Design a protein around this nucleic acid. Structure first.
Ligand SMILES: [Zn+2]
Length: 263
DNA sequence: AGACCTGGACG
DNA sequence: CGTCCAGGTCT
């Protein structure tokens, strides 16, 4: 999940958990728990607290409790649902938070890649993983100046630049590829080879793409996949020029682009 | 890369 | 059967 997907999980999950009080926390795959590293301390400190809110920072979910904040990263497969304690669990359910009202927040993750960190609220933003994060793309803090400051300094591909969460938070392969297309820029271009005119353009497209995806509930629930120009369309005609979309490897990752529209 | 991980589209 | 992919991030 990327920013648009997570922002959607955030909007729909909040009303389902807000004001509930944790009675128990049950863990079935401890590796998910990263801080405290001991999964028993993790469970213990949360018992008794009440969900006060739910925020998003980059690709992370930030559950706001009483004194603590829980930082959850879904990675590839992480999924949350709220259900009755009286029903059997779905498979691949690794962490369950039991509330006093008989309902449960269930976390599922087939590949077990996801992570959970719990800190005191005041500590969350100055500790891993939130600390190194770049500006929110839909915030004024994300500007062409910001993008340019990082681009000139590096020799790596513009794709690799935008995937770096320290540069800007929220983009993954899908939306990076789409943004680059919309901005007419080849993914493999050295970041530094970008001009001021391209930087501004890319910034406008990055903001627009992520914005529309969020309004459309993301890609699959979501509907933004009907609005994909290049991702997963390899071999198919470009929607703008009819050139077959191409797929190669940029920075070790499957990359999609139109060889005509992008330069 | 290869790491952690599990499973679905491929012949 | 296998291998080849997969919307993350780390080493
Ligand atoms: Zn094209």
């Amino acid at each position: 999940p990327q920013l648009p997907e997570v922002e959607t999980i955030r909007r729909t999950l909040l009303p389902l958990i807000v004001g509930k009080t944790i009675e128990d926390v049950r863990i079935f795959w401890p590796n998910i728990i990263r801080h405290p590293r001991d999964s028993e301390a993790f469970a213990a400190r949360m018992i008794g607290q009440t969900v006060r809110g739910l925020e998003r920072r980059g690709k992370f979910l930030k559950f706001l409790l009483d004194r603590d904040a829980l930082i959850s990263h879904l990675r590839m497969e992480g999924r949350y649902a709220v259900a009755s304690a009286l029903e059997p669990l779905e498979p691949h359910t690794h962490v369950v938070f039991c509330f006093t009202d008989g309902s449960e927040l269930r976390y599922r993750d087939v590949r077990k890649f996801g992570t959970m960190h719990v800190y005191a609220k005041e500590e969350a933003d100055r500790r891993p993983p939130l600390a190194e994060l770049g500006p929110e793309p839909l915030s004024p803090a994300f500007s062409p100046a910001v993008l340019a400051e990082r681009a000139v300094k590096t020799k790596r591909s513009v794709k690799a630049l935008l995937l770096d969460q320290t540069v800007v938070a929220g983009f993954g392969c899908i939306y990076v590829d789409e943004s680059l297309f919309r901005a007419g820029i080849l993914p493999g271009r050295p970041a530094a080879s970008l001009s001021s005119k391209e930087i501004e353009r890319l910034h406008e497209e990055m903001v627009a793409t992520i914005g529309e995806a969020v309004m459309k509930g993301g890609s699959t629930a979501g509907t933004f996949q009907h609005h994909l120009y290049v991702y997963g369309r390899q071999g198919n005609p470009c929607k703008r020029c009819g050139t077959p979309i191409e797929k190669t490897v940029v920075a070790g990752r499957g990359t999609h682009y139109c060889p005509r529209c992008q330069r």
